[PDB]
Write a protein that binds this ligand. Structure first.
Ligand SMILES: CCN1c2cc(C(=O)c3cnn(C)c3O)ccc2N(C)S1(=O)=O
Ligand SMILES: CCN1c2cc(C(=O)c3cnn(C)c3O)ccc2N(C)S1(=O)=O
Ligand SMILES: [Co+2]
Ligand SMILES: [Co+2]
Lengths: 369, 374
């Protein structure tokens, strides 16, 4: 049951994620060097953009945009930087029928950041609109059709190459699996209802939604998704559990709601993590007891793990499974000093969950250890 | 044998201790400088070490120590305003000192604005005493009476949480120490700031070949280099001046929102290997046209100076030369460390030459003009 079918309009996929950061040039360099992206496009003084510098980096279909202000006392960007640290500002969706989505969103009460506008260059035209979501986060809808340019109109090829990024081993991340937003206490349901009402998303039901793990996760979660379930937006709030809630820590250190992690889907997670580790990236410490009590729990299970299990243990890759399939997942250390944003790499084998079984599994290994 | 002014009665500025940057993302900043510029992360302070308000990443390359600092909490007033006003930039030019008391007494007596009066910190490796005074803009000087402290960097710092196999693997860049640190001032402020160094710290004006030359038309700046009595620490002070083009010093002040450090120069004894391996790490530098090297070789025809380094390689790497009859220096400037047109770095090697490359204002301007009009 996906609820009522929206009468026109479609959210095709994640278009890109825009970050507001203190130093967009060094941030782009962090994600190309550490996380396997390559700089794709630029806007700045050199291109006529005199207020904002924008570095676009890409890995297959994953596009991150890093933005910093050129001028002192830019009040909007500055306040966001002082409040949150480096973080996600805009989760952008590629859309069909922008007019229908925007008209509906406006009728249903969305706060409009910028009404429908368009930008053009030699390679075609793209239309946009931007509304607010939780915290300081916004959604830009991008009606890009089959735009043939570099990324978006007005963006130019990077000023310089990067021989270091070019020589480093490829990390094989393909697309954005899901983007997770942490909310303050008691806000999960109202934020989920915003997606249902304003965008006509519906709640996505997975194997995770059928077995509660509140005691070990210290959170509540609802996953909201569009009608075709191509875009997945988990919404968390803090909950009482055995240990301090990570969601409450996020809200305290981020200064309110925001994106806690972005999960990046791969079809070869062993090569991904080997090559990310070669790039100096670090991931959560996983005690070896986790892997003893998984080979044994899998003894009473019929699912067949295709990846070499000793290599999974060596790389500290996690596994969650039911009887019909499984997923592999691993979490980076934080992208900044604040205990706020991190990244996830995930590979799916006939399993639509998000790893909730690992809340209990990891918690007990760390505790026993 | 120069007039270095009155000898200070007590107190010694030994060398640059470290440079502290206030930045938006200190973890990512340290990674920029280790990966791109050849540093190694040395030490850390943060939540995991008991430092609950500030995260600090210390990176080192031989004697060069850079510290990157970010706030942990929302709406940290002091660091927040600095970030919004300046972008990422230098906050503290720290000096290793002897006889802190007399230095601090003299500075306070002469009107230094004190940021933090003398205090001290200790751990299992010993004690270090500090004081901090303001200099130009939002920049400050911490005096570090380091004596012979035995810890990693300073009391309270710990080893980095993780190693970095990428920083470890990359080619060595052979930068040794901080040659000088340049502060850009707004209109008409150069003399006042230079006087502050003479009066408050008992620095004196350092005279070099550059001071005996006419370059304002090409440089669009006026400069005075202040240095400590023993001339181990050099602090050039720039202000805008009318020139043939817009002053880069004026542009700095517009985009930095006031005075601040414009560049830090790092001394090397093998600039060829340094620049080769910085380029291998993806660093970029100013583009220098072939006309520069053609015109330089022509000028050198009337000189007795002997360039030791391979000139074809210097041209290939776009390294600059300035020279007189007794020696020369080699120098090269990175692209900017951030999007705002503010801070950059300099790599410099000296062969019996105490200048700062002022001959290259004319040489580069004229080389670019000849390359266009040809
Ligand atoms: C990294 C924090 N941790 C985390 C995150 C997820 C996750 O990404 C997730 C769960 N539900 N939804 C919708 C998601 O996106 C799953 C398990 C675990 N752990 C065991 S953890 O504490 O290490
Ligand atoms: C990078 C901007 N440029 C620059 C900087 C210096 C320098 O480091 C310097 C000059 N005086 N003092 C005290 C210094 O430290 C010398 C020459 C040139 N150019 C020709 S430049 O426009 O490329
Ligand atoms: Co996830
Ligand atoms: Co210099």
């Amino acid at each position: 049951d996906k609820g009522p079918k929206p009468d026109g309009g479609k959210f095709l996929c994640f278009d890109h994620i825009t970050f507001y950061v203190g130093n967009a040039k060094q941030a782009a360099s962090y994600y190309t060097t550490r996380m396997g992206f390559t700089e794709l496009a630029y806007q700045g003084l050199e291109t006529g953009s005199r207020k904002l510098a924008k570095h676009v980096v890409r890995q297959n279909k994953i596009v991150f945009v890093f933005v910093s202000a050129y001028e002192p006392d830019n009040t909007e960007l500055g306040a966001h930087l002082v409040r949150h640290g480096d973080g996600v500002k805009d989760v952008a969706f590629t859309v069909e029928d922008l007019d229908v989505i925007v008209k509906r969103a406006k009728q249903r009460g969305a706060e409009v950041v910028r009404d429908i506008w368009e930008e053009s260059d030699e390679f075609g035209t793209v239309r946009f609109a931007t509304v607010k979501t939780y915290g300081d986060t916004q959604h830009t809808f991008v009606e890009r059709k089959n735009y043939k340019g570099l990324f978006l109109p007005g963006y130019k090829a990077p000023l310089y190459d990067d021989v270091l990024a070019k020589q480093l081993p490829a990390t094989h991340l393909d697309f954005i699996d899901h983007v997770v937003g942490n909310q303050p206490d008691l806000q999960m349901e109202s934020v989920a209802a915003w997606y249902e009402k304003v965008l006509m998303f519906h709640r996505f039901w997975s194997v995770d939604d059928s077995q509660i793990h509140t005691e070990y996760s210290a959170l509540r979660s609802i996953v909201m998704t569009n009608y075709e379930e191509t875009v997945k937006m988990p919404i968390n709030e803090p909950a009482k559990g055995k240990k301090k809630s990570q969601i409450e820590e996020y809200v305290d250190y981020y200064g309110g709601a925001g994106v806690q992690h972005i999960a990046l889907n791969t079809s070869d997670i062993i090569t991904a993590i080997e090559n990310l580790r070669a790039r100096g990236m670090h991931f959560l410490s996983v005690p070896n007891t986790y892997y003893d009590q998984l080979r044994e729990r899998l003894k009473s299970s019929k699912v067949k793990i295709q990846e070499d299990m000793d290599t999974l243990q060596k790389l500290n890759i996690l596994i969650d499974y039911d009887e019909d399939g499984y997923l592999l997942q691993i979490f980076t250390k934080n992208m900044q000093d604040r205990p706020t944003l991190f990244l996830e790499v995930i590979q799916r084998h006939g399993h639509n969950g998000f790893g909730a079984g690992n809340f209990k599994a990891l918690f007990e290994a760390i505790e026993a250890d």
